[PDB]
Design a protein around this ligand. Structure first.
Ligand SMILES: Cc1cc2nc3c(=O)[nH]c(=O)nc-3n(C[C@H](O)[C@H](O)[C@H](O)COP(=O)(O)OP(=O)(O)OC[C@H]3O[C@@H](n4cnc5c(N)ncnc54)[C@H](O)[C@@H]3O)c2cc1C
Ligand SMILES: Cc1cc2nc3c(=O)[nH]c(=O)nc-3n(C[C@H](O)[C@H](O)[C@H](O)COP(=O)(O)OP(=O)(O)OC[C@H]3O[C@@H](n4cnc5c(N)ncnc54)[C@H](O)[C@@H]3O)c2cc1C
Ligand SMILES: CC[n+]1c(-c2ccccc2)c2cc(N)ccc2c2ccc(N)cc21
Ligand SMILES: CC[n+]1c(-c2ccccc2)c2cc(N)ccc2c2ccc(N)cc21
Ligand SMILES: CC[n+]1c(-c2ccccc2)c2cc(N)ccc2c2ccc(N)cc21
Ligand SMILES: [Zn+2]
Ligand SMILES: [Zn+2]
Lengths: 230, 230
């Protein structure tokens, strides 16, 4: 025991299906004795834009602004904006980061994309060297808990949306694996708006039940083969 | 042959490599006699967050906020925030929409993701039914012009990032095709930061060169096969 969890949560409405999945996670992980922290991005009015306001004081090359370089240097010189370093501290302390969001355009809502863009800066999340298996958050687990509009059927290899694994690639491989996370299998709650009450409650219960043994889980092999292969 | 082009541009720095690609696109399309509009998202401080501020009228369900439902209804009633309908006018009038951006976590920067989330609402960009080949922006072309940190070699089937086409899927298929766009082949300018000044000039010149004959190109088959192979 002694585990710390950060839930990064991206829904506008507390009473939403996403809201419920977030609350079940808080309740169940809290019941287990885990340390639990929630970043409620919409409630925090979290800034999604990557701008020169993210660096306090003097820039490293004020003639030509390169956000990635400047935030690298700012991390090294401890001059990042405080909303960013507040989140970095939650991530640093976490053993597990759960992302709770509705799927927006086969990806995360923009407010959560901005969290990924602004929080996972060079020197904090990865470096040269130290990416993919050697990324700087190695030792930590990440989990995507996604809800969709489209049905499970639509999310098959030959269905109109293709396999759900296809849209996970930029998130699980390009982002989280790159930064060194080992990736737990995603939690995909398909089409709750279309689903009946019974089906919805079933999906909530599947999540709660998964959470009972989350610390027993093996990570997926975050590979092209897993995402695209037979 | 009287074509209208919208460039949706997501970089903070006019002197950046993205800025140059944006500017040569303006130069070359303007030279051709095309009508050209640029949505400079950072300069406009474009709002990326999907919030209830995006609806100014009476909500369909004020007790439980569902962004997608409320913006659909707001679109029909014409009570969307005006920054959204301003962009929708640009899209409505465009024959070709070029997206110019650096790759952030195998995707678009959050400020551009916010543009996609907020501008492409139900009723404007698609209906149910009325999506993929039946999407409401049918007849229009779209083109992703992407710059990367990683090398072309890293973005191959056997490289650590997997093939470049893999990360295009959520954008080309899940977003643009869903809304009815036909998709022109992507322009990917690999690893300019790492490249020599001469390799950089060459990549800019190649884009400019391609643009001379852009109106003669056919779209890709925006399918799982095109993105992922057999
Ligand atoms: C801009 C945008 C882009 C999108 N792009 C995509 C896309 O690319 N692909 C895709 O598939 N979808 C897409 N969607 C749809 C989106 O993913 C879904 O609308 C979203 O996942 C629904 O999740 P929710 O939490 O908002 O559902 P909700 O509407 O909040 O929940 C569904 C119902 O469940 C009820 N409920 C809440 N809690 C419980 C509970 N504890 N037990 C039982 N019932 C409960 C709620 O009251 C609600 O009535 C997009 C939507 C938007 C707005
Ligand atoms: C949050 C974040 C996430 C990222 N995630 C990824 C990822 O998942 N995968 C990945 O591969 N990369 C990733 N990157 C890297 C990113 O894609 C690159 O940093 C970006 O593409 C570089 O493009 P730029 O326009 O900013 O380059 P610049 O720094 O602006 O360009 C490089 C050089 O070109 C020069 N230049 C400008 N105009 C010209 C011209 N006309 N001729 C010649 N030289 C010129 C500039 O002066 C500069 O010196 C990420 C970066 C950030 C910040
Ligand atoms: C701009 C630095 N830089 C590069 C990068 C660009 C060119 C060469 C080496 C690394 C980068 C490359 C990849 N693949 C993924 C993420 C990042 C990144 C992420 C955040 C940041 N703050 C700077 C970042
Ligand atoms: C919430 C409506 N809704 C749904 C949707 C959700 C559930 C059932 C049917 C459609 C949707 C589904 C997919 N695949 C892709 C985009 C959207 C979307 C996009 C914008 C918006 N403003 C509402 C949207
Ligand atoms: C291995 C690719 N790669 C990266 C790199 C780019 C993005 C992410 C990780 C590494 C690189 C990054 C920096 N800063 C400087 C030089 C190089 C480089 C130099 C030569 C080469 N042959 C590959 C190179
Ligand atoms: Zn991986
Ligand atoms: Zn497609």
């Amino acid at each position: 025991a002694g585990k710390k969890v950060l839930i990064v949560y991206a829904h506008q409405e507390p009473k939403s299906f996403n809201g419920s999945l977030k609350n079940v996670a808080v309740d169940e992980l809290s019941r287990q004795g885990c340390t639990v922290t929630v970043s409620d991005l919409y409630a925090m009015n979290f800034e999604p834009r990557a701008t020169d306001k993210d660096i306090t004081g003097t820039l490293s090359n004020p003639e030509v602004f390169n956000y990635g370089v400047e935030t690298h240097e700012a991390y090294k010189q401890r001059s990042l904006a405080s909303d960013i370093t507040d989140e970095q501290k939650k991530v640093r302390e976490a053993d597990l980061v759960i992302f709770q969001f509705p799927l927006y355009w086969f990806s995360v809502p923009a407010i959560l994309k901005g969290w990924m863009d602004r929080v996972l800066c060079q020197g904090f999340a990865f470096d040269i060297p130290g990416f993919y298996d050697s990324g700087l958050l190695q030792g930590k687990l990440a989990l995507l808990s996604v809800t969709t509009g489209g049905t499970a059927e639509m999310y098959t290899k030959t269905g109109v949306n293709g396999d759900s694994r296809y849209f996970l690639w930029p998130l699980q491989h390009g982002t989280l694996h790159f930064c060194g996370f080992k990736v737990l299998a995603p939690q995909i709650s398909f089409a709750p708006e279309i689903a009946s009450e019974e089906e919805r409650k079933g999906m909530v219960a599947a999540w709660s039940q998964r959470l009972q043994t989350i610390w027993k889980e093996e990570p997926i092999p975050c590979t092209a083969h897993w995402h695209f292969g037979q």
